[PDB]
Amino acid sequence: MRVVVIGAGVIGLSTALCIHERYHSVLQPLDVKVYADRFTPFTTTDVAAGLWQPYTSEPSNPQEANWNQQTFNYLLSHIGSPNAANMGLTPVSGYNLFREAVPDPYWKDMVLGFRKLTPRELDMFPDYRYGWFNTSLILEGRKYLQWLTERLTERGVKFFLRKVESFEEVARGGADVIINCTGVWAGVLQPDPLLQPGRGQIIKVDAPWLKNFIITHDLERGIYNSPYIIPGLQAVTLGGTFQVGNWNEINNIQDHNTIWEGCCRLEPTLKDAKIVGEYTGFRPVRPQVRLEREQLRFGSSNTEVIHNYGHGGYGLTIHWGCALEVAKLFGKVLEERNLL
Amino acid sequence: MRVVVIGAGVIGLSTALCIHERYHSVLQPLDVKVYADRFTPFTTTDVAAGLWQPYTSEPSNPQEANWNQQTFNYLLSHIGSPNAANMGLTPVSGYNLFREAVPDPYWKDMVLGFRKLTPRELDMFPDYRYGWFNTSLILEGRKYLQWLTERLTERGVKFFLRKVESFEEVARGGADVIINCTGVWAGVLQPDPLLQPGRGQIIKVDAPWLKNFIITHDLERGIYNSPYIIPGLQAVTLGGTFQVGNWNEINNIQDHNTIWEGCCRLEPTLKDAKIVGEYTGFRPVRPQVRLEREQLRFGSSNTEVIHNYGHGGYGLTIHWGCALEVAKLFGKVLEERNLL
Ligand SMILES: Cc1cc2nc3c(=O)[nH]c(=O)nc-3n(C[C@H](O)[C@H](O)[C@H](O)COP(=O)(O)OP(=O)(O)OC[C@H]3O[C@@H](n4cnc5c(N)ncnc54)[C@H](O)[C@@H]3O)c2cc1C
Ligand SMILES: Cc1cc2nc3c(=O)[nH]c(=O)nc-3n(C[C@H](O)[C@H](O)[C@H](O)COP(=O)(O)OP(=O)(O)OC[C@H]3O[C@@H](n4cnc5c(N)ncnc54)[C@H](O)[C@@H]3O)c2cc1C
Ligand SMILES: O=C([O-])C1=[NH+]CCC1
Ligand SMILES: O=C([O-])C1=[NH+]CCC1
């Protein structure tokens, strides 16, 4: 069959791989090709902190909780492998600081070693009087993409720099099945008011002495609209902005002072940190992830399409689960066509 | 008063600073000076890993449990301050793997968030079926020694590169009080059958992606005669040797293999870790830390002496609790001499 994936982010490449690994043996020419107007490190995936943590609230679709859980285990099963770090994967323990007592997250048991913070530990962060501690994983979006690209390439998959203007051209181009992993820009290919950008700015800095992630929470200003320090492989990520509706791709000094001044107050040792870089990205916000099939006829050419976008600020946290689901829906596309 | 501190390690410098800050305001000339035949980075403290962690077995001396506690609370309180990292101090979380069940360490309540590992986590470590997880602190001996030095420098204390041949030469040289912090070579100035070296070799390596510490235990081969991965400030420490009675100051190939192969089997990502160095030091092994006074007359010259040595593998872990004890004993010397 001829598969066409649009999107070179974590959802694009992970879904492409998951599809190939699943049906390359049963399907003869499985022409999977990737179409993107910008590849790594130019994606939102590259700008991501990398940490594995869903929101503090339950998703509207419990399927997502399932997909997160599946993504943790998939990545957890890699801990103990020599190529874990080369995939951009490594463990990290950390805190979630609250200005007041909050209920446990739904993902409390998904993560490793969850427990509430003792007052003795809160003494480290005076601005907050409640929190959680747990162990999770780092999935450096950039490193993970270079890996997936490296993996898919050897799988025979071809990448093409192309801004898809419509599903039309792709279908008539020869696409038997089209996987739409276009993120926050999906509305172009097909209008969806539910998808809005969740602008975020970060400050990548050299502060290697920082091992633990630290995520503070302001219940009034919204999720990730509070400072956070999230260590990665080669650097640390400082952030604290989530602006929904903002399409400004430029870094503003206003947010630079909120992040820095906030993070530096969180961790005073940050004063010695050498700023490596600063970026801005658009989290694909949607009331719920769009992962479903859709048939599209274009003059007899009934082209099947499967969407997978709207992952907001948990794209790396949910990538494998969602990808596994697309492959499941791709099987049904294969069997209704009697192609299996 | 003229105080002569013998030893430029964490025990010398820390005890030196603890006495000065203690009596500089009440004692007019407080001639404090340090004598050492080797300074950082050529001390045992410079080779140390930095992790605050006593032995898994209880001590014969209940004072060591307290001194350990006092040291943790001292270092912990530095967390939240801007200079913690410049002192070589940073929080670290990690595991303690056993090949079988063991009893909880007396210091379980001293650390942060102590709890037993679960079957789910233990699966990560195929060679180990038991253990614990907790949060601790790193105290990079090298960086800390560079810190105490500069601190004491500005305090007025002078440092002299001189190999003391006997307490006598010092006692007759104008020393009203001597503080013995000579480490494992303490036996020279005064023989000690109980004091023996606990030779250790380590492998510094560039593996920044590693955030947690893993300390494996082989109950048959003794403490630290099993691989351990302790990440530090700028690098990662790989270890696994504790050979008492061994005075060989040369790095052997045998131990290199023990550490490398073991750690690389514990943490396979180590295959990409570029080695930065390889070191050998001698732990001041003693059934119990010697911290006590000793009057020594040298022909009317009654020189008071205060020993502080035999800290083995928990020097960085217990330094402050010991140093704080010396300044107390030193307080008795002063008042028994009517100098207060
Ligand atoms: C500052 C910040 C920090 C974040 N931190 C985290 C974190 O710690 N953990 C986490 O899980 N998530 C985090 N996220 C969110 C995470 O980055 C996203 O959920 C994830 O990147 C979404 O993946 P995606 O598949 O949509 O790919 P995206 O990279 O958004 O897009 C992939 C592809 O879409 C292609 N594309 C789009 N439209 C077209 C078109 N018309 N034609 C052709 N190609 C097209 C692009 O070319 C691109 O290659 C963060 C986000 C931001 C902004
Ligand atoms: C491989 C290894 C790893 C370790 N890891 C850890 C760890 O993770 N955590 C931990 O808490 N501990 C650890 N330790 C133990 C720790 O290093 C020691 O407890 C600590 O260094 C002891 O300090 P010290 O006072 O003996 O000083 P030392 O540095 O041993 O000695 C201080 C000074 O004594 C001077 N001196 C001695 N005799 C004389 C003399 N006659 N005249 C003049 N000067 C003299 C020397 O010049 C020297 O500079 C480790 C030890 C080793 C070997
Ligand atoms: O998108 C984001 O800001 C984050 N995602 C995981 C924790 C922080
Ligand atoms: O002596 C040693 O090697 C260690 N001390 C505490 C952790 C490792």
Side-chain angles (χ1 to χ4, degrees):
Chain A
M1 191 182 276
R2 295 200 56 137
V3 185
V4 174
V5 184
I6 320 172
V10 61
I11 304 303
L13 307 188
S14 72
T15 297
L17 192 82
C18 201
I19 282 181
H20 188 288
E21 296 181 329
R22 234 55 44 139
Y23 310 101
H24 77 291
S25 63
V26 312
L27 292 184
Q28 24 35 60
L30 182 61
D31 304 335
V32 189
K33 60 203 78 63
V34 180
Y35 283 1
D37 54 329
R38 85 266 290 181
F39 297 89
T40 180
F42 304 113
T43 65
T44 312
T45 299
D46 297 291
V47 192
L51 184 72
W52 189 101
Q53 186 174 109
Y55 295 168
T56 61
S57 58
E58 313 194 50
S60 53
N61 185 11
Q63 288 259 253
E64 297 176 47
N66 188 72
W67 297 330
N68 286 326
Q69 184 150 240
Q70 299 175 143
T71 306
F72 190 71
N73 300 333
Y74 163 70
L75 300 170
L76 214 217
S77 64
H78 282 119
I79 299 308
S81 178
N83 289 301
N86 303 317
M87 292 180 231
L89 178 69
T90 212
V92 270
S93 302
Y95 313 79
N96 279 278
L97 307 160
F98 294 93
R99 206 87 65 176
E100 67 166 313
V102 294
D104 301 319
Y106 71 87
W107 50 264
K108 70 177 193 68
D109 277 330
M110 300 184 191
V111 292
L112 267 18
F114 177 94
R115 52 174 196 83
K116 288 76 163 298
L117 298 172
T118 58
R120 189 171 176 230
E121 295 179 87
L122 293 166
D123 286 338
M124 300 193 271
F125 329 91
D127 292 338
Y128 302 90
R129 66 178 70 213
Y130 191 88
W132 318 315
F133 176 91
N134 69 249
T135 302
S136 188
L137 322 160
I138 286 295
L139 227 201
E140 207 143 277
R142 163 58 171 170
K143 198 57 188 178
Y144 188 42
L145 260 48
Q146 303 184 270
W147 169 268
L148 288 174
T149 299
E150 196 177 272
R151 220 80 291 118
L152 282 171
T153 294
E154 63 193 42
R155 298 310 301 259
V157 177
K158 309 301 294 172
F159 299 101
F160 295 102
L161 194 288
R162 247 301 291 172
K163 171 165 174 48
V164 180
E165 298 297 343
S166 68
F167 287 130
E168 241 269 319
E169 55 168 72
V170 192
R172 77 184 183 240
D176 282 2
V177 179
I178 299 175
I179 311 299
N180 184 232
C181 308
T182 49
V184 78
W185 304 274
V188 181
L189 303 187
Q190 175 172 306
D192 181 26
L194 292 197
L195 185 65
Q196 306 146 78
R199 186 187 178 281
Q201 204 183 290
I202 58 171
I203 304 179
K204 279 288 192 169
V205 81
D206 282 342
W209 58 85
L210 295 172
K211 314 299 171 175
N212 304 312
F213 70 77
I214 305 172
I215 298 170
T216 58
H217 298 271
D218 188 349
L219 303 178
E220 306 188 352
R221 302 204 294 125
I223 191 74
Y224 305 133
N225 271 319
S226 189
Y228 65 55
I229 299 168
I230 292 171
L233 284 44
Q234 319 118 240
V236 177
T237 288
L238 268 54
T241 66
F242 195 141
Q243 299 142 182
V244 49
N246 192 342
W247 278 100
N248 181 49
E249 72 295 306
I250 297 303
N251 302 299
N252 57 104
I253 184 63
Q254 184 217 135
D255 288 341
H256 172 286
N257 299 345
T258 304
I259 291 171
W260 190 265
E261 173 187 331
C263 288
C264 193
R265 179 187 174 89
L266 230 197
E267 186 52 56
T269 65
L270 223 33
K271 69 183 198 300
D272 311 295
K274 178 175 172 294
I275 290 184
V276 189
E278 196 160 356
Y279 320 92
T280 281
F282 303 111
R283 298 183 189 75
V285 190
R286 246 200 71 142
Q288 40 233 285
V289 181
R290 189 165 184 228
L291 192 45
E292 55 183 50
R293 296 173 60 191
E294 185 181 63
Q295 306 67 216
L296 291 187
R297 288 80 179 194
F298 293 114
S300 176
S301 293
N302 177 34
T303 299
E304 199 79 23
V305 161
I306 314 182
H307 305 284
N308 193 14
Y309 62 78
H311 306 272
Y314 52 81
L316 291 165
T317 302
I318 204 164
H319 83 279
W320 195 250
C322 292
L324 243 37
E325 196 62 49
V326 170
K328 266 58 168 181
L329 308 182
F330 184 80
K332 315 200 309 301
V333 167
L334 254 57
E335 245 321 90
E336 62 182 48
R337 281 169 178 50
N338 281 274
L339 268 45
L340 281 183
Chain B
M1 181 170 273
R2 300 193 59 131
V3 186
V4 180
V5 181
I6 310 178
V10 67
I11 306 296
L13 311 190
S14 70
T15 302
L17 181 65
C18 194
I19 278 181
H20 190 286
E21 303 175 336
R22 222 69 31 158
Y23 300 103
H24 75 307
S25 70
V26 299
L27 274 189
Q28 7 60 73
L30 191 52
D31 310 357
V32 185
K33 72 203 68 60
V34 183
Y35 285 162
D37 56 320
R38 75 267 294 194
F39 291 99
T40 178
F42 316 105
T43 72
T44 307
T45 304
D46 295 299
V47 176
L51 183 65
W52 184 105
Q53 187 172 102
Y55 294 152
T56 60
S57 65
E58 299 197 57
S60 70
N61 187 9
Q63 281 280 246
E64 295 173 59
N66 178 66
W67 296 335
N68 271 323
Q69 181 137 249
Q70 300 180 126
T71 311
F72 191 81
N73 294 353
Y74 164 77
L75 305 180
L76 216 230
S77 71
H78 284 95
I79 305 306
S81 160
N83 287 309
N86 290 312
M87 298 187 204
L89 181 58
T90 196
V92 284
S93 283
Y95 315 85
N96 268 305
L97 303 175
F98 295 92
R99 208 87 64 162
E100 67 173 276
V102 289
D104 298 335
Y106 72 102
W107 51 256
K108 69 173 188 70
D109 285 351
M110 287 175 206
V111 293
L112 270 6
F114 174 90
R115 64 179 186 80
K116 287 70 166 301
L117 292 187
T118 68
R120 185 191 180 208
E121 302 177 83
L122 285 169
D123 272 282
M124 297 189 261
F125 319 108
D127 293 315
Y128 300 85
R129 69 172 71 209
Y130 194 80
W132 336 297
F133 183 93
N134 69 266
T135 296
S136 188
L137 303 169
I138 288 307
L139 218 205
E140 205 141 285
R142 163 55 171 163
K143 199 64 178 171
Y144 190 37
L145 255 32
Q146 299 186 273
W147 173 266
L148 292 173
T149 299
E150 160 191 89
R151 209 86 298 111
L152 285 163
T153 294
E154 58 189 51
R155 297 298 304 250
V157 182
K158 304 302 300 181
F159 302 111
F160 306 106
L161 188 286
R162 248 296 297 170
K163 175 175 163 48
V164 170
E165 304 283 28
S166 68
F167 297 148
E168 238 249 305
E169 64 159 70
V170 181
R172 68 180 189 243
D176 296 27
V177 176
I178 292 176
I179 317 293
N180 194 205
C181 306
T182 43
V184 72
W185 309 268
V188 183
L189 307 190
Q190 188 165 303
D192 201 32
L194 299 181
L195 176 68
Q196 310 145 69
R199 184 189 181 281
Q201 196 178 292
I202 63 170
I203 301 179
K204 285 281 191 184
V205 78
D206 277 358
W209 60 86
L210 301 180
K211 311 301 170 188
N212 298 317
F213 72 75
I214 308 175
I215 294 176
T216 64
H217 305 283
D218 185 338
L219 297 167
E220 295 161 2
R221 300 208 293 144
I223 202 94
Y224 309 139
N225 267 301
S226 191
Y228 66 44
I229 305 169
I230 301 173
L233 271 47
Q234 315 122 234
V236 192
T237 290
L238 283 31
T241 67
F242 195 141
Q243 315 138 161
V244 55
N246 188 344
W247 279 106
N248 181 44
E249 72 301 314
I250 294 306
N251 296 315
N252 56 110
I253 202 68
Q254 179 198 155
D255 289 326
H256 175 300
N257 296 2
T258 310
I259 301 169
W260 191 250
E261 184 191 278
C263 295
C264 193
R265 178 176 176 94
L266 225 187
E267 186 51 60
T269 57
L270 255 342
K271 72 168 194 301
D272 307 294
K274 172 182 175 294
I275 298 183
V276 165
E278 191 158 5
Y279 314 94
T280 295
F282 306 112
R283 305 167 174 89
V285 188
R286 244 198 73 133
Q288 52 228 277
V289 175
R290 191 183 183 209
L291 189 66
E292 55 189 24
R293 300 164 59 189
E294 194 180 86
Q295 311 68 222
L296 304 183
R297 288 79 176 197
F298 303 103
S300 173
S301 297
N302 175 19
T303 302
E304 201 75 36
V305 181
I306 310 179
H307 298 281
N308 193 1
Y309 71 90
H311 302 289
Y314 51 80
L316 296 169
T317 300
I318 200 174
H319 77 295
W320 192 259
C322 290
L324 227 55
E325 188 67 75
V326 173
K328 258 71 163 185
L329 304 194
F330 179 104
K332 297 203 309 309
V333 173
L334 258 44
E335 241 305 85
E336 79 171 32
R337 281 167 170 50
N338 282 266
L339 266 57
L340 300 171

Short mmCIF file of all heavy atoms in Angstrom, two decimals, chain B residues 13 17 20-21 74 83 86-87 143-157 159:
data_model
loop_
_atom_site.label_atom_id
_atom_site.label_comp_id
_atom_site.label_asym_id
_atom_site.label_seq_id
_atom_site.Cartn_x
_atom_site.Cartn_y
_atom_site.Cartn_z
N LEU B 13 40.02 21.60 57.12
CA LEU B 13 39.42 22.87 56.72
C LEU B 13 38.08 23.12 57.40
O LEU B 13 37.82 24.23 57.86
CB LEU B 13 39.25 22.91 55.21
CG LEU B 13 40.50 22.51 54.43
CD1 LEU B 13 40.29 22.82 52.96
CD2 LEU B 13 41.70 23.26 54.96
N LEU B 17 37.39 26.07 60.09
CA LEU B 17 36.37 27.09 59.91
C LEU B 17 35.37 27.08 61.06
O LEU B 17 34.91 28.12 61.51
CB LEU B 17 35.63 26.87 58.59
CG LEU B 17 34.53 27.89 58.26
CD1 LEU B 17 35.13 29.28 58.05
CD2 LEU B 17 33.77 27.45 57.02
N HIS B 20 37.04 28.81 64.19
CA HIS B 20 37.21 30.23 63.94
C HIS B 20 35.89 30.99 64.08
O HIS B 20 35.80 31.93 64.87
CB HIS B 20 37.80 30.45 62.55
CG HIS B 20 38.22 31.86 62.29
ND1 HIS B 20 37.32 32.87 62.07
CD2 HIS B 20 39.45 32.42 62.22
CE1 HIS B 20 37.98 34.00 61.87
NE2 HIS B 20 39.27 33.75 61.96
N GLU B 21 34.88 30.58 63.32
CA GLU B 21 33.56 31.22 63.37
C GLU B 21 33.01 31.16 64.79
O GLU B 21 32.15 31.95 65.17
CB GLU B 21 32.57 30.47 62.47
CG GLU B 21 32.97 30.35 61.01
CD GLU B 21 31.99 29.50 60.21
OE1 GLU B 21 31.28 28.66 60.82
OE2 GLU B 21 31.94 29.66 58.98
N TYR B 74 22.99 20.38 58.06
CA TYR B 74 23.81 21.54 57.78
C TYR B 74 23.85 21.74 56.27
O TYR B 74 23.53 22.83 55.78
CB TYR B 74 25.22 21.35 58.36
CG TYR B 74 26.27 22.30 57.82
CD1 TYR B 74 26.35 23.62 58.27
CD2 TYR B 74 27.18 21.88 56.85
CE1 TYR B 74 27.31 24.49 57.75
CE2 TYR B 74 28.14 22.74 56.34
CZ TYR B 74 28.20 24.04 56.79
OH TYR B 74 29.13 24.89 56.25
N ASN B 83 24.59 29.98 46.72
CA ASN B 83 25.94 29.41 46.70
C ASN B 83 26.11 27.91 46.89
O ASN B 83 27.24 27.41 46.85
CB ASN B 83 26.86 30.17 47.65
CG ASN B 83 27.23 31.54 47.12
OD1 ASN B 83 27.67 31.67 45.97
ND2 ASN B 83 27.04 32.57 47.93
N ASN B 86 28.27 26.32 44.28
CA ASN B 86 29.65 26.80 44.31
C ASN B 86 30.43 26.11 45.43
O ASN B 86 31.65 26.07 45.40
CB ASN B 86 29.68 28.32 44.46
CG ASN B 86 29.20 29.05 43.21
OD1 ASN B 86 29.64 28.74 42.10
ND2 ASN B 86 28.30 30.01 43.39
N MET B 87 29.70 25.59 46.41
CA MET B 87 30.30 24.84 47.52
C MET B 87 30.49 23.39 47.09
O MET B 87 31.18 22.62 47.76
CB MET B 87 29.36 24.81 48.72
CG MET B 87 29.04 26.13 49.30
SD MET B 87 28.11 25.91 50.79
CE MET B 87 27.29 27.51 50.82
N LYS B 143 35.57 20.61 45.02
CA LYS B 143 34.93 21.92 44.99
C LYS B 143 34.71 22.50 46.39
O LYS B 143 34.85 23.70 46.60
CB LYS B 143 33.60 21.82 44.24
CG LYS B 143 33.05 23.14 43.75
CD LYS B 143 33.96 23.77 42.71
CE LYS B 143 33.38 25.07 42.19
NZ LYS B 143 34.35 25.79 41.34
N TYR B 144 34.38 21.62 47.34
CA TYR B 144 34.13 22.01 48.72
C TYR B 144 35.39 22.46 49.41
O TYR B 144 35.35 23.34 50.27
CB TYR B 144 33.54 20.84 49.50
CG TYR B 144 33.03 21.22 50.87
CD1 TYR B 144 32.40 22.44 51.09
CD2 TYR B 144 33.11 20.32 51.92
CE1 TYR B 144 31.86 22.75 52.33
CE2 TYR B 144 32.57 20.63 53.16
CZ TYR B 144 31.94 21.84 53.35
OH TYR B 144 31.37 22.11 54.56
N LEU B 145 36.50 21.81 49.08
CA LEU B 145 37.81 22.13 49.63
C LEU B 145 38.30 23.45 49.05
O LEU B 145 39.01 24.20 49.73
CB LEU B 145 38.81 21.02 49.31
CG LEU B 145 39.18 20.09 50.47
CD1 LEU B 145 38.03 19.91 51.44
CD2 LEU B 145 39.64 18.77 49.90
N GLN B 146 37.95 23.72 47.80
CA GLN B 146 38.32 24.98 47.17
C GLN B 146 37.49 26.09 47.83
O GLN B 146 37.93 27.23 47.91
CB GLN B 146 38.03 24.94 45.68
CG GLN B 146 38.78 23.88 44.91
CD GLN B 146 38.55 23.98 43.42
OE1 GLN B 146 37.60 23.43 42.88
NE2 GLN B 146 39.43 24.71 42.74
N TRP B 147 36.31 25.72 48.32
CA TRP B 147 35.38 26.64 48.98
C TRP B 147 35.78 26.98 50.42
O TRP B 147 35.72 28.15 50.83
CB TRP B 147 33.97 26.04 48.97
CG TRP B 147 32.96 26.83 49.77
CD1 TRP B 147 32.60 26.63 51.07
CD2 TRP B 147 32.20 27.96 49.31
NE1 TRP B 147 31.67 27.56 51.45
CE2 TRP B 147 31.41 28.39 50.39
CE3 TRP B 147 32.12 28.64 48.09
CZ2 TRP B 147 30.53 29.47 50.29
CZ3 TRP B 147 31.25 29.72 47.99
CH2 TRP B 147 30.47 30.13 49.08
N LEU B 148 36.11 25.96 51.20
CA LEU B 148 36.51 26.16 52.59
C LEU B 148 37.83 26.93 52.68
O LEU B 148 38.03 27.72 53.59
CB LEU B 148 36.63 24.81 53.29
CG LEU B 148 35.34 24.02 53.50
CD1 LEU B 148 35.65 22.64 54.05
CD2 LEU B 148 34.43 24.77 54.46
N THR B 149 38.71 26.67 51.71
CA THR B 149 40.02 27.32 51.63
C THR B 149 39.85 28.84 51.50
O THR B 149 40.30 29.59 52.35
CB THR B 149 40.79 26.79 50.41
OG1 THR B 149 41.00 25.39 50.56
CG2 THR B 149 42.13 27.50 50.26
N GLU B 150 39.19 29.25 50.41
CA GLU B 150 38.89 30.66 50.11
C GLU B 150 38.15 31.32 51.26
O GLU B 150 38.39 32.47 51.59
CB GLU B 150 38.04 30.71 48.83
CG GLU B 150 37.25 32.00 48.60
CD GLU B 150 36.23 31.85 47.47
OE1 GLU B 150 35.08 31.45 47.75
OE2 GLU B 150 36.59 32.14 46.31
N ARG B 151 37.25 30.56 51.88
CA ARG B 151 36.46 31.05 52.99
C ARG B 151 37.38 31.33 54.18
O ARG B 151 37.32 32.40 54.77
CB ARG B 151 35.41 30.01 53.38
CG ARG B 151 34.14 30.58 54.00
CD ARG B 151 33.12 31.00 52.95
NE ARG B 151 33.59 32.06 52.06
CZ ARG B 151 33.87 31.89 50.77
NH1 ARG B 151 33.73 30.71 50.19
NH2 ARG B 151 34.29 32.92 50.04
N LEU B 152 38.24 30.36 54.50
CA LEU B 152 39.18 30.48 55.61
C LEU B 152 40.24 31.52 55.29
O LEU B 152 40.73 32.20 56.18
CB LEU B 152 39.87 29.14 55.87
CG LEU B 152 39.10 28.03 56.56
CD1 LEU B 152 39.82 26.72 56.33
CD2 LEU B 152 38.97 28.34 58.04
N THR B 153 40.58 31.63 54.02
CA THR B 153 41.58 32.60 53.59
C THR B 153 41.09 33.96 54.01
O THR B 153 41.74 34.65 54.79
CB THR B 153 41.77 32.56 52.07
OG1 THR B 153 42.32 31.30 51.70
CG2 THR B 153 42.69 33.66 51.62
N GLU B 154 39.88 34.31 53.57
CA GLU B 154 39.30 35.60 53.92
C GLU B 154 39.07 35.78 55.42
O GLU B 154 38.97 36.90 55.90
CB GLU B 154 38.01 35.84 53.13
CG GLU B 154 36.94 34.80 53.34
CD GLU B 154 35.77 34.94 52.38
OE1 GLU B 154 36.00 35.02 51.16
OE2 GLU B 154 34.61 34.94 52.86
N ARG B 155 39.03 34.67 56.16
CA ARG B 155 38.82 34.69 57.61
C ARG B 155 40.10 35.04 58.39
O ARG B 155 40.04 35.35 59.58
CB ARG B 155 38.30 33.34 58.11
CG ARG B 155 36.94 32.90 57.59
CD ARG B 155 35.84 33.85 58.00
NE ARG B 155 35.76 34.04 59.44
CZ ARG B 155 34.77 33.59 60.21
NH1 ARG B 155 33.77 32.90 59.67
NH2 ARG B 155 34.75 33.87 61.50
N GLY B 156 41.25 34.93 57.73
CA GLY B 156 42.52 35.25 58.38
C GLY B 156 43.47 34.08 58.58
O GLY B 156 44.66 34.29 58.82
N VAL B 157 42.95 32.86 58.49
CA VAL B 157 43.74 31.64 58.65
C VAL B 157 44.79 31.48 57.55
O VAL B 157 44.52 31.74 56.38
CB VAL B 157 42.82 30.38 58.66
CG1 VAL B 157 43.64 29.12 58.89
CG2 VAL B 157 41.76 30.53 59.74
N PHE B 159 47.78 29.08 55.52
CA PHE B 159 48.02 27.69 55.12
C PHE B 159 49.50 27.44 54.80
O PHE B 159 50.09 28.14 53.97
CB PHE B 159 47.16 27.33 53.91
CG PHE B 159 45.68 27.49 54.15
CD1 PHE B 159 44.97 28.49 53.50
CD2 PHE B 159 45.01 26.65 55.02
CE1 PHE B 159 43.61 28.65 53.72
CE2 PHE B 159 43.65 26.80 55.25
CZ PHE B 159 42.94 27.81 54.60
#
